[PDB]
Amino acid sequence: RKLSGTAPNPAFPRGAVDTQMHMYLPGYPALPGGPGLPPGALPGPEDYRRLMQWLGIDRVIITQGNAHQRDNGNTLACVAEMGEAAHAVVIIDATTTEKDMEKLTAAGTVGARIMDLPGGAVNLSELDAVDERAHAADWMVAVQFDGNGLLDHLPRLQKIRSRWVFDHHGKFFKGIRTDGPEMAALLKLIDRGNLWFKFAGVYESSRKSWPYADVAAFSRVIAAHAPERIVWGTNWPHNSVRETAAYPDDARLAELTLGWLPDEAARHRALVENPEALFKLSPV
């Protein structure tokens, strides 16, 4: 993996938050139900610190990988090793008690994860159970599903109590029209004020070569509509990539997708104020 390069231009503001990454420590096996660990080298704190230093990332949200299913051990241990800069997004479900939630909060947990696509630990059918607890704890929920099913999920997404983020540019694998009912439904969800939209992992859904114009088209529209509701992430360590040859340059990728925002004020929001609001972080 590439862990150094030329800095993003313009440079990230102090306090910049990577809202989308996974991290891996030795001694935390993959669990049945998931994809298994990243074949190697194990992408851990040392490698990610290098990435942070390259990009100018100051704060990181470390999210539970599918590899670990419902066992939060690795993620929590990564946050602890990373120290002040890191917070966790973990797995909860209907078995998670109030006391469990306080343990997770004290250990730096700021949210829970729903992953409806293959490999995910908790799919959309458990949304209400995750949401009721997250809301009670004043957490957020990261929600990832095939965006082309948005209209089917609309009634349940409307009922979400918590702050939440729609992962990875919505993963609209087939695209979406910028003025169709899908876009209309998404903007109405955003208007309510409890939904953020994530610019991370564009290459996991684009059917185009760089500069990923298909995803750019609708991402520009969403960011223009609601610049105080966009967040950004690396998608490090890019688990869907298997060969050195296809591994993205994280600084260039950042410049590209941040370039889809409407102006410089929106770029600062996307990197600092917006994630501070989504995750309820102390202000920089």
Swiss-Prot record:
Cofactor binding annotation: Does not require a metal cofactor.
Tree of life domain: Bacteria
SUPFAM superfamilies: Metallo-dependent hydrolases
Keyword Iron-sulfur set for record: no
Pathway: Carbohydrate acid metabolism; D-galacturonate degradation via prokaryotic oxidative pathway
Reactions listed under catalytic activity: D-galactaro-1,5-lactone = D-galactaro-1,4-lactone
E.C. number(s) listed in UniProt: 5.4.1.4
UniProt keyword terms in alphabetical order: Isomerase
GO MF term set: hydrolase activity; isomerase activity
Known function: Catalyzes the isomerization of D-galactaro-1,5-lactone to D-galactaro-1,4-lactone. This is a step in the oxidative degradation pathway of D-galacturonate, which allows A.tumefaciens to utilize D-galacturonate as a sole carbon source.
Similarity section: Belongs to the metallo-dependent hydrolases superfamily.
Name listed for the protein in its UniProt record: D-galactarolactone isomerase
Record organism: Agrobacterium fabrum (strain C58 / ATCC 33970) (Agrobacterium tumefaciens (strain C58))
